[PDB]
Amino acid sequence: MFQQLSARLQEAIGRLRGRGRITEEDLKATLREIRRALMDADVNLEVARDFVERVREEALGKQVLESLTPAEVILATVYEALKEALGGEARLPVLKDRNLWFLVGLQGSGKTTTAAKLALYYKGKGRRPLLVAADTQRPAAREQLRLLGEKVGVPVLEVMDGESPESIRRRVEEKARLEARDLILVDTAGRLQIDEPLMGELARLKEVLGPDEVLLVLDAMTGQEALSVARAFDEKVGVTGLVLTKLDGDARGGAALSARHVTGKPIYFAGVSEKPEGLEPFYPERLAGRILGM
Numbered sequence: 242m243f244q245q246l247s248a249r250l251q252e253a254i255g256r257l258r259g260r261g262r263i264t265e266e267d268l269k270a271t272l273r274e275i276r277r278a279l280m281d282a283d284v285n286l287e288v289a290r291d292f293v294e295r296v297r298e299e300a301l302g303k304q305v306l307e308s309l310t311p312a313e314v315i316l317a318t319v320y321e322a323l324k325e326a327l328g329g330e331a332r333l334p335v336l337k338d339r340n341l342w343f344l345v346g347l348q349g350s351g352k353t354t355t356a357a358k359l360a361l362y363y364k365g366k367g368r369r370p371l372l373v374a375a376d377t378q379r380p381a382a383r384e385q386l387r388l389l390g391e392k393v394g395v396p397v398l399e400v401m402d403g404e405s406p407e408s409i410r411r412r413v414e415e416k417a418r419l420e421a422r423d424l425i426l427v428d429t430a431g432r433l434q435i436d437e438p439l440m441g442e443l444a445r446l447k448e449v450l451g452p453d454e455v456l457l458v459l460d461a462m463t464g465q466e467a468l469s470v471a472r473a474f475d476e477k478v479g480v481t482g483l484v485l486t487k488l489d490g491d492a493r494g495g496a497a498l499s500a501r502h503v504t505g506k507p508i509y510f511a512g513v514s515e516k517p518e519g520l521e522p523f524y525p526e527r528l529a530g531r532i533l534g535m
């Protein structure tokens with residue numbers, strides 16, 4: 242994953258391999274290349290500075306200038322730096338008997354596809370999901386989820402035009418109660434940009450529906466710019482976790498590496514394809530190892 246970054250990080254580190262002990266000027270050259278690699282991957286400035294800082298300082302603390310295999314030392318410290326940036330320990334929502342989740346984000350971020358992906362994911366984990374197309378102004382948006390629900394074999398409750406959050410709540414609670422659905426996935430409305438009035442409806446919907454999780458869906462391809470809306474959603478609504486989509490089309494990885502710093506929210510899942518099966522729980526340690534070709 243993150244082809245360009247993986248290639249560059251590995252190339253930079255390899256310069257310290259197969260040539261005996263290295264000089265600090267040798268180390269500095271590799272450190273500068275790593276820094277350039279991060280900047281080119283669209284990684285947050287502070288994250289990049291911190292990254293290289295600890296790689297250097299940790300390597301030096303591990304007597305890298307005296308090691309007979311210095312590239313292995315740097316690889317290890319680069320792995321720890323990567324792991325930190327990605328989130329440390331993997332995290333996933335803790336499900337209970339009743340689970341109502343909100344999928345929020347701008348249009349095109351991958352909300353509808355992710356809703357279905359999550360339905361299919363938990364469907365095979367002992368859960369009975371219910372998809373809810375909550376756009377009370379755009380019928381076309383609701384239809385999109387309707388078709389997807391069919392493909393994944395998961396029921397889709399469509400809200401009616403202008404339906405009040407109270408009517409939506411009672412209708413969802415009824416369907417879920419009568420059909421034994423323990424995982425409700427609400428696909429909320431979204432525009433190409435943050436809409437104040439729309440954000441007001443969203444907050445009101447949260448108040449009435451009382452979601453257990455509020456997943457902010459982010460298109461990794463938009464770079465670190467994708468994280469700009471995070472603050473707005475958390476203040477007005479309250480984001481509990483993130484979903485990074487289109488990671489299969491992201492060669493940089495800037496959004497994934499910067500999410501932690503900028504948003505302070507954990508990444509629960511990663512979208513790795515346009516297909517309903519293209520969903521994977523976010524694993525910081527696994528991803529760090531992959532990027533470094535481990």
Ligand SMILES: Nc1nc2c(ncn2[C@@H]2O[C@H](COP(=O)(O)OP(=O)(O)O)[C@@H](O)[C@H]2O)c(=O)[nH]1
Pocket residue numbers: 346347348349350351352353354355431486487488489490511512513514515519
């Ligand atoms: N390659 C790839 N495409 C994705 C992924 N998630 C969503 N998409 C595509 O992104 C576009 C927008 O997704 P959609 O669910 O409609 O977003 P919404 O407007 O936020 O509901 C669609 O063409 C999807 O097929 C992903 O993980 N990988």
Ligand SMILES: [Mg+2]
Pocket residue numbers: none
């Ligand atoms: Mg460890």
Ligand SMILES: [Mg+2]
Pocket residue numbers: 352353354382385428
């Ligand atoms: Mg949608």
